[PDB]
Amino acid sequence: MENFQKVEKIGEGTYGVVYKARNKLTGEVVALKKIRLDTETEGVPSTAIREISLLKELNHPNIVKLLDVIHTENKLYLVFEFLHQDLKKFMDASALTGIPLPLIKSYLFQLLQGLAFCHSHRVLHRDLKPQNLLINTEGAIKLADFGLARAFGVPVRTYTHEVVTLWYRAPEILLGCKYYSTAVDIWSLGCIFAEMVTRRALFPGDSEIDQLFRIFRTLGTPDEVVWPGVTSMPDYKPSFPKWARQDFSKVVPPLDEDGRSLLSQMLHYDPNKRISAKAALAHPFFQDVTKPVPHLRL
Numbered sequence: 001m002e003n004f005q006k007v008e009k010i011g012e013g014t015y016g017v018v019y020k021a022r023n024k025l026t027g028e029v030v031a032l033k034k035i036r037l038d039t040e041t042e043g044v045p046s047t048a049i050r051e052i053s054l055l056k057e058l059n060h061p062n063i064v065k066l067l068d069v070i071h072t073e074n075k076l077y078l079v080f081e082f083l084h085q086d087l088k089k090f091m092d093a094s095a096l097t098g099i100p101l102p103l104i105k106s107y108l109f110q111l112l113q114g115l116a117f118c119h120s121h122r123v124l125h126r127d128l129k130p131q132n133l134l135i136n137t138e139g140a141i142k143l144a145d146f147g148l149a150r151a152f153g154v155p156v157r158t159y160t161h162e163v164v165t166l167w168y169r170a171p172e173i174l175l176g177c178k179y180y181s182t183a184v185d186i187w188s189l190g191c192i193f194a195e196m197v198t199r200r201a202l203f204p205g206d207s208e209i210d211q212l213f214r215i216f217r218t219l220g221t222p223d224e225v226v227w228p229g230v231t232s233m234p235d236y237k238p239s240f241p242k243w244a245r246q247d248f249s250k251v252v253p254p255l256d257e258d259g260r261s262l263l264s265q266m267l268h269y270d271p272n273k274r275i276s277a278k279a280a281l282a283h284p285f286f287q288d289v290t291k292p293v294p295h296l297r298l
């Protein structure tokens with residue numbers, strides 16, 4: 001568009017480049033995502049247009065606001081509210097000392113509120129990761145890109161050939177389950193929670209089988225006892241090695257007993273057993289939750 005001065009490139013997202021831009025008629029500063037398609041084919045599938053446009057109504061204080069969905073030329077632009085930092089960069093910048101535990105708790109509590117809202121409206125994210133959790137100077141954290149995965153799919157590589165990360169992917173997806181449920185987002189958020197606390201990714205796989213086997217090495221190879229139906233999933237192999245489950249006290253120290261209990265429920269293998277966002281908000285871990293302001297150096 002010529003509707004925007006394009007103040008900088010913010011980064012490269014799953015589907016295309018993301019810019020910080022100023023709207024000239026409002027003076028508003030926004031984030032613009034350029035999403036394309038191989039022009040020749042389907043194009044923008046008109047079906048992605050309708051369901052993405054529906055996301056303009058999915059508003060909550062912990063969901064990054066989708067301001068507009070512009071279909072023009074053969075390009076789809078999503079105009080979003082702008083936030084000043086993403087959690088991946090904030091975690092990297094906090095490597096030395098760690099994000100303080102009360103800020104970690106606040107962020108998790110706010111993220112669960114955004115999931116509970118979206119889930120109650122039957123919208124899933126499916127590709128939660130630190131890069132798409134955005135924060136501001138006032139202590140808020142918001143989820144970006146809810147609903148897009150349903151619309152475009154999740155590719156192996158991005159538009160610029162970068163590898164899409166598998167680290168936060170739920171085991172039912174890796175085992176080939178066709179139908180995602182809201183439990184996939186709870187798994188991803190559990191993995192992000194553990195990474196905030198320990199300052200290392202919980203399961204940093206570099207292929208689908210490395211990702212699955214990292215999960216099995218820590219939580220034990222799932223069986224029919226812990227996950228009824230697992231041996232029948234499309235990508236399950238009877239030849240998977242049989243690892244014993246480790247103890248949580250070893251996986252996320254120094255998390256206290258409430259935190260470890262909650263994380264265990266967010267990482268249950270059976271998606272039917274995995275805690276819901278609503279139920280997680282009532283867990284005793286959040287009894288003393290507060291809303292601290294982070295040190296942001298913009």
Ligand SMILES: CCc1cnn2c(NCc3ccc[n+](O)c3)cc(N3CCCC[C@H]3CCO)nc12
Pocket residue numbers: 010011012013018020031032064080081082083084085086089131132133134144145
């Ligand atoms: C929803 C669009 C949006 C709004 N703000 N924002 C931010 N703001 C933080 C920030 C700002 C200025 C420079 N840096 O480095 C970080 C980052 C971000 N993204 C992270 C990086 C890859 C692109 C992309 C993915 C997730 O939308 N997307 C957005």
